[PDB]
Amino acid sequence: MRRYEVNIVLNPNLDQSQLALEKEIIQRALENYGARVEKVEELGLRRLAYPIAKDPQGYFLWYQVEMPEDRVNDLARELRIRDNVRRVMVVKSQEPFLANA
């Protein structure tokens, strides 16, 4: 019983029309995970143009869910098996950590 954040990077090569279909498919995937979304965060990554200098292009979604930690590998396993998905990152939702004191 707890909440986790999902980090998935999909090939941002689809056009605008195709990108619209993702919003309809991505919404159903939340349900595929049998998890409920408590909040929706938009990363809006910045795709780099010909010249490269800013951050790397990609799409990172962050949502608060309510699912067991054991079924995470099962639902995560499906995400990595998809064609548009490149990898699956599952992290625990807790306080940040850094050495600076």
Coordinates of N, CA and C in Angstrom, one line a residue, residues 7-100:
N7 N 8.3 6.7 -14.6 CA 9.2 7.5 -15.5 C 9.4 6.7 -16.8
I8 N 8.7 7.1 -17.8 CA 8.8 6.4 -19.1 C 9.2 7.3 -20.2
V9 N 10.2 6.9 -21.0 CA 10.6 7.8 -22.2 C 10.2 7.2 -23.5
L10 N 9.4 7.9 -24.2 CA 9.0 7.3 -25.6 C 9.6 8.1 -26.7
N11 N 9.8 7.5 -27.8 CA 10.4 8.1 -29.0 C 9.5 9.4 -29.4
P12 N 10.1 10.5 -29.2 CA 9.3 11.8 -29.5 C 9.5 12.1 -31.0
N13 N 9.3 11.1 -31.8 CA 9.4 11.4 -33.3 C 8.0 11.4 -34.0
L14 N 7.0 11.0 -33.3 CA 5.6 11.0 -33.9 C 5.2 12.4 -34.2
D15 N 4.4 12.6 -35.2 CA 3.9 14.0 -35.6 C 2.9 14.5 -34.6
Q16 N 2.3 15.6 -34.9 CA 1.2 16.2 -34.0 C 0.0 15.2 -34.0
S17 N -0.5 14.9 -35.1 CA -1.7 14.0 -35.2 C -1.4 12.7 -34.4
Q18 N -0.3 12.1 -34.7 CA 0.0 10.8 -33.9 C 0.2 11.1 -32.4
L19 N 0.8 12.2 -32.1 CA 1.0 12.5 -30.7 C -0.4 12.6 -30.0
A20 N -1.4 13.1 -30.7 CA -2.8 13.1 -30.1 C -3.2 11.7 -29.6
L21 N -3.0 10.7 -30.5 CA -3.4 9.4 -30.1 C -2.8 8.9 -28.8
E22 N -1.6 9.3 -28.5 CA -0.9 8.9 -27.3 C -1.7 9.4 -26.1
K23 N -2.2 10.6 -26.1 CA -3.0 11.1 -25.0 C -4.2 10.1 -24.7
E24 N -4.8 9.6 -25.7 CA -5.9 8.6 -25.5 C -5.4 7.2 -25.1
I25 N -4.2 6.8 -25.6 CA -3.7 5.5 -25.2 C -3.0 5.6 -23.8
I26 N -2.2 6.7 -23.6 CA -1.5 6.8 -22.3 C -2.6 6.9 -21.2
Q27 N -3.7 7.5 -21.4 CA -4.7 7.5 -20.3 C -5.2 6.1 -20.0
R28 N -5.4 5.3 -20.9 CA -5.8 3.9 -20.6 C -4.7 3.1 -19.9
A29 N -3.5 3.4 -20.2 CA -2.4 2.7 -19.6 C -2.4 2.9 -18.1
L30 N -2.8 4.0 -17.6 CA -2.8 4.3 -16.2 C -3.7 3.2 -15.6
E31 N -4.8 2.9 -16.3 CA -5.7 1.8 -15.8 C -5.0 0.5 -16.0
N32 N -4.3 0.3 -17.1 CA -3.6 -1.0 -17.3 C -2.8 -1.3 -16.1
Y33 N -2.2 -0.3 -15.5 CA -1.3 -0.5 -14.3 C -2.2 -0.8 -13.1
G34 N -3.5 -0.8 -13.3 CA -4.4 -1.1 -12.1 C -4.2 0.0 -11.0
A35 N -3.6 1.1 -11.4 CA -3.3 2.1 -10.4 C -4.2 3.4 -10.6
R36 N -4.5 4.1 -9.6 CA -5.3 5.4 -9.8 C -4.4 6.6 -9.8
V37 N -4.6 7.5 -10.7 CA -3.7 8.7 -10.7 C -4.2 9.8 -9.7
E38 N -3.4 10.1 -8.8 CA -3.8 11.1 -7.8 C -3.4 12.5 -8.3
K39 N -2.4 12.6 -9.1 CA -2.0 14.0 -9.7 C -1.4 13.8 -11.0
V40 N -1.5 14.8 -11.9 CA -0.8 14.7 -13.2 C 0.2 15.8 -13.4
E41 N 1.4 15.4 -13.6 CA 2.5 16.4 -13.8 C 3.0 16.5 -15.2
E42 N 3.1 17.6 -15.8 CA 3.5 17.7 -17.2 C 5.0 18.1 -17.3
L43 N 5.8 17.3 -17.8 CA 7.3 17.7 -17.9 C 7.5 18.6 -19.2
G44 N 6.9 18.3 -20.3 CA 7.0 19.1 -21.5 C 8.5 19.2 -21.8
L45 N 9.2 18.1 -21.9 CA 10.6 18.2 -22.3 C 10.9 19.1 -23.4
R46 N 12.1 19.5 -23.7 CA 12.4 20.4 -24.9 C 13.2 19.7 -25.9
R47 N 12.5 19.2 -27.0 CA 13.2 18.5 -28.1 C 14.3 19.4 -28.7
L48 N 15.5 19.0 -28.8 CA 16.6 19.8 -29.4 C 16.5 19.8 -30.9
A49 N 16.8 21.0 -31.5 CA 16.7 21.1 -33.0 C 18.0 20.6 -33.6
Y50 N 18.3 20.9 -34.9 CA 19.6 20.4 -35.5 C 20.7 20.6 -34.5
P51 N 21.0 21.8 -34.1 CA 22.1 22.0 -33.2 C 21.8 21.4 -31.8
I52 N 22.7 20.9 -31.1 CA 22.4 20.3 -29.8 C 23.2 21.1 -28.7
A53 N 22.5 21.4 -27.6 CA 23.2 22.1 -26.5 C 22.3 22.0 -25.2
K54 N 21.0 22.2 -25.3 CA 20.1 22.1 -24.2 C 20.1 20.7 -23.7
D55 N 19.1 20.4 -22.9 CA 18.9 19.0 -22.4 C 18.5 18.0 -23.5
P56 N 18.6 16.8 -23.3 CA 18.3 15.7 -24.3 C 16.8 15.7 -24.5
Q57 N 16.4 15.4 -25.7 CA 15.0 15.3 -26.1 C 14.3 14.0 -25.5
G58 N 13.1 14.1 -25.2 CA 12.4 12.9 -24.6 C 11.1 13.3 -23.9
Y59 N 10.4 12.3 -23.4 CA 9.1 12.6 -22.7 C 9.0 11.9 -21.3
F60 N 9.0 12.7 -20.3 CA 9.0 12.1 -18.9 C 7.6 12.4 -18.2
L61 N 6.9 11.4 -17.9 CA 5.6 11.7 -17.2 C 5.7 11.4 -15.7
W62 N 5.0 12.1 -14.9 CA 5.1 11.9 -13.4 C 3.7 11.8 -12.8
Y63 N 3.3 10.7 -12.3 CA 1.9 10.6 -11.7 C 1.9 9.9 -10.4
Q64 N 1.0 10.3 -9.5 CA 1.0 9.7 -8.2 C 0.0 8.5 -8.2
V65 N 0.4 7.3 -7.9 CA -0.5 6.1 -8.0 C -0.7 5.5 -6.6
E66 N -1.6 4.5 -6.6 CA -1.9 3.7 -5.4 C -1.9 2.2 -5.7
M67 N -0.7 1.7 -5.9 CA -0.6 0.2 -6.2 C 0.4 -0.5 -5.3
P68 N 0.3 -1.7 -5.2 CA 1.2 -2.6 -4.4 C 2.6 -2.6 -5.1
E69 N 3.7 -2.7 -4.3 CA 5.0 -2.7 -4.9 C 5.3 -4.0 -5.6
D70 N 4.6 -5.1 -5.4 CA 4.9 -6.4 -6.0 C 4.3 -6.4 -7.5
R71 N 3.1 -5.8 -7.7 CA 2.5 -5.8 -9.0 C 3.2 -4.8 -9.9
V72 N 4.1 -4.0 -9.3 CA 4.8 -3.0 -10.1 C 5.6 -3.6 -11.2
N73 N 6.4 -4.7 -10.9 CA 7.2 -5.3 -11.9 C 6.3 -5.9 -13.0
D74 N 5.2 -6.4 -12.7 CA 4.3 -7.0 -13.7 C 3.8 -5.9 -14.6
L75 N 3.3 -4.9 -14.1 CA 2.7 -3.8 -15.0 C 3.9 -3.1 -15.7
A76 N 5.0 -3.0 -15.0 CA 6.2 -2.3 -15.6 C 6.7 -3.2 -16.8
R77 N 6.7 -4.5 -16.6 CA 7.1 -5.4 -17.6 C 6.4 -5.2 -18.9
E78 N 5.1 -4.8 -18.8 CA 4.4 -4.6 -20.1 C 4.9 -3.3 -20.8
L79 N 5.1 -2.3 -20.0 CA 5.6 -1.0 -20.6 C 6.9 -1.2 -21.4
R80 N 7.8 -1.9 -20.9 CA 9.1 -2.2 -21.6 C 8.9 -3.1 -22.8
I81 N 7.8 -3.9 -22.8 CA 7.6 -4.8 -23.9 C 6.9 -4.0 -25.1
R82 N 6.4 -2.9 -24.8 CA 5.8 -2.1 -25.9 C 6.8 -1.6 -26.9
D83 N 6.4 -1.3 -28.1 CA 7.3 -0.8 -29.2 C 7.7 0.6 -28.9
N84 N 6.8 1.5 -28.6 CA 7.1 2.9 -28.3 C 7.9 3.1 -27.0
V85 N 7.8 2.2 -26.1 CA 8.5 2.3 -24.8 C 10.0 1.9 -25.0
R86 N 10.9 2.6 -24.4 CA 12.3 2.3 -24.6 C 12.8 1.6 -23.3
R87 N 12.3 2.1 -22.1 CA 12.7 1.5 -20.8 C 11.7 1.8 -19.8
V88 N 11.8 1.2 -18.6 CA 10.9 1.4 -17.5 C 11.6 1.8 -16.2
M89 N 11.3 2.9 -15.7 CA 12.0 3.3 -14.4 C 11.0 3.4 -13.3
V90 N 11.2 2.6 -12.3 CA 10.2 2.7 -11.1 C 11.0 3.1 -9.9
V91 N 10.5 4.2 -9.3 CA 11.2 4.8 -8.1 C 10.3 4.9 -6.9
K92 N 10.8 4.9 -5.7 CA 9.9 5.0 -4.5 C 9.6 6.5 -4.3
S93 N 8.4 6.8 -3.9 CA 8.0 8.3 -3.7 C 8.4 8.7 -2.2
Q94 N 9.5 9.4 -2.1 CA 9.9 9.8 -0.7 C 10.7 11.1 -0.8
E95 N 11.2 11.5 0.3 CA 12.0 12.8 0.4 C 13.3 12.7 -0.5
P96 N 13.7 13.8 -1.0 CA 14.9 13.9 -1.8 C 16.2 13.6 -1.0
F97 N 17.3 13.4 -1.6 CA 18.5 13.2 -0.8 C 19.8 13.7 -1.6
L98 N 20.6 14.5 -0.9 CA 21.8 15.1 -1.5 C 22.8 15.6 -0.4
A99 N 24.0 15.5 -0.7 CA 25.0 15.9 0.3 C 25.5 17.4 0.0
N100 N 25.1 18.3 0.9 CA 25.5 19.7 0.7 C 25.5 20.4 2.1

